[PDB]
Amino acid sequence: VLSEGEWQLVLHVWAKVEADVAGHGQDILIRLFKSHPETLEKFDRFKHLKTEAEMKASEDLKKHGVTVLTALGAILKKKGHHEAELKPLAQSHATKHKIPIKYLEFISEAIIHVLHSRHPGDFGADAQGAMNKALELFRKDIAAKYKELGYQG
Numbered sequence: 001v002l003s004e005g006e007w008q009l010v011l012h013v014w015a016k017v018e019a020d021v022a023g024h025g026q027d028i029l030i031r032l033f034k035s036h037p038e039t040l041e042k043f044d045r046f047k048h049l050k051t052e053a054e055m056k057a058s059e060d061l062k063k064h065g066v067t068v069l070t071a072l073g074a075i076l077k078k079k080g081h082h083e084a085e086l087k088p089l090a091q092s093h094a095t096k097h098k099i100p101i102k103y104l105e106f107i108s109e110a111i112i113h114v115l116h117s118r119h120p121g122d123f124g125a126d127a128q129g130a131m132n133k134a135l136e137l138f139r140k141d142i143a144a145k146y147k148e149l150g151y152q153g
């Protein structure tokens, strides 16, 4: 469980992300695709993008970035009590999108990197630690749903 003070740190920085959801969403998906190219191959709708400049230019990619961060924000603000938000997400990602749990670890890494770049003063070691915990809690819960369904892997 995170403590109340750890959840404060997480939601303090997130309220800054929400100042520019679209620009954060871009940076994170682009970081993921460059760091782990195999993840881009899961997206039929972005597979054609070949360079970072092409990624940056895509309005559809920027739109999806907002989709992703908006779902994550709704989860984070539930401070652990995120059963109803997380279930639909685990089901589509396991059964329709076919996303390994490992790739959720990759995009967690991408989120922490971007937060670090954009918000040093609100993202010191204590905040990074809390955010890491929050994202581990997100993964652990997702992984349990995957296991139930037969997808752990």
Ligand code: HEM
Pocket (backbone or CB within 6 Å): 039, 040, 042, 043, 044, 045, 067, 068, 069, 071, 072, 088, 089, 092, 093, 097, 099, 103, 104, 107
């Ligand atoms: C922070 C973790 C993530 C969140 C919050 C998340 C959230 C979402 C949301 C809310 C949607 C649209 C509705 C749905 O189909 O569920 C979506 C679609 C999708 N996600 Fe994720 N996602 C996450 C991680 C990933 C990762 C790591 C991958 C792949 C490497 C992935 C692949 C997809 C694909 C393929 C779609 C369908 C895109 C399209 O064709 O419209 N997701 N995701």
